[PDB]
Amino acid sequence: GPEASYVRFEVPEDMQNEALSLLEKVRESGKVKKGTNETTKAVERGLAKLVYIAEDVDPPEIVAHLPLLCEEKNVPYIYVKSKNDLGRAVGIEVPCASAAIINEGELRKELGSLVEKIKGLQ
Amino acid sequence: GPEASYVRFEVPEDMQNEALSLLEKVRESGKVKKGTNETTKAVERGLAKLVYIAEDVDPPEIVAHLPLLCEEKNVPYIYVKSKNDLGRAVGIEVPCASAAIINEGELRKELGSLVEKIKGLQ
RNA sequence: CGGCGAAGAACCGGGGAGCCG
RNA sequence: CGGCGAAGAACCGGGGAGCCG
Ligand code: NA
Ligand code: NA
Ligand code: NA
Ligand code: NA
Ligand code: NA
Ligand code: NA
Ligand code: NA
Ligand code: NA
Ligand code: NA
Ligand code: NA
């Protein structure tokens, strides 16, 4: 219905909040790219460890290529309800449709656990 | 002072008007590049037959590089008093800092005699 | 019609956080 | 204090006349 086509699975809210929290914390020791241009290049260049996509992107066409791209490059991705939260999580002043963790820093294990839960959705 | 350093020699008013009438005619006969970006490239690419530099360009750094470039590339150049005149003559709606003839069309004689006039000064 | 635009519109690639009053 | 900016600022490269209300 209201959700655009590019949202391919439901991410429980607690999993979303863990993921947003880890994305904000990874900036302290690892490296994130933020925004759809850099997110897309991060995946295309083989650099993405975890891609975040906001569910409320409108027009959906801005991020709609990302899930199929991630799947082709075997990059895990997770949805978050709000591009506002996503922009806050990555530390910028405007909404953010998509982001990528590219260096996991000190959070390798927590991101690993999160990725295995994502897999467990489908 | 008041003219910027890039005005390396004086050009008389009969000649600047000669140069601007010629420029306006070469448009429907040959080819003109208009604007500093296109004029620099024409000189660098070896395509410029006559470049026009307005004397009232503020800031001067917009065009200051052009005279030594023209000399390096063996390209004659002429100063005209007004970038508004220069704009009107290349048929655009805004001021124009510099321009270049790239083909003389059917006005090869009037161009040559002006070029020899230019050579005569300094 | 005004405002802006060759001191470089649109558009494209690089870039990745400031620009303006 | 506002307006705008990750739906991509500044800037570099290509482009060469439109963009906006
Ligand atoms: Na980019
Ligand atoms: Na890593
Ligand atoms: Na760890
Ligand atoms: Na022309
Ligand atoms: Na031109
Ligand atoms: Na250019
Ligand atoms: Na102008
Ligand atoms: Na100008
Ligand atoms: Na880019
Ligand atoms: Na350019």
Residue numbers in the entry:
A (entry chain C), B (entry chain D): -3 to 118
Authors' description from the paper:
k-turns are highly abundant structural motifs in RNA that generate a tight kink in the axis of RNA, mediating tertiary contacts and serving as protein binding sites. k-turns play an important structural role in a number of key cellular RNA-protein complexes, including the box C/D snoRNP, where they bind the L7Ae (in archaea) or 15.5k protein (in eukaryotes) as the first stage of assembly. Sheared G:A base pairs are frequently found in key helical junctions in RNA structure, and most notably within the core of kink turns (k-turns) as tandem G:A, A:G base pairs. We have synthesized a series of variants of the standard k-turn Kt-7 from Haloarcula marismortui in which adenine has been substituted by N6-methyladenine. We have determined the crystal structure of one of these species both free and protein-bound, showing the environment of the methyl group and the way the modification is accommodated into the k-turn structure.
Crystals of self-complementary RNA containing two Kt-7 k-turns were obtained with and without bound AfL7Ae, at resolutions of 1.99 and 2.09 Å respectively. The structure of the k-turn containing N6-methyladenine 2b is closely similar in the L7Ae bound and protein free states, superimposing with an all-atom RMSD of 0.52 Å. The protein places its recognition helix in the widened major groove on the outside of the k-turn, making specific interactions with the conserved guanine nucleobases of the G:A base pairs and further non-specific backbone contacts. However, close inspection of the A2b:G2n base pair reveals some local conformational readjustment. In the 2b:2n base pair of the unmodified Kt-7, as well as the 1b:1n and 3b:3n base pairs of the modified Kt-7 both hydrogen bond lengths fall in the normal range of 2.8–3.1 Å. However that of N6-methyladenine 2b Kt-7 bound to AfL7Ae it is 3.7 Å and is thus beyond the range normally considered to be stably bonded.
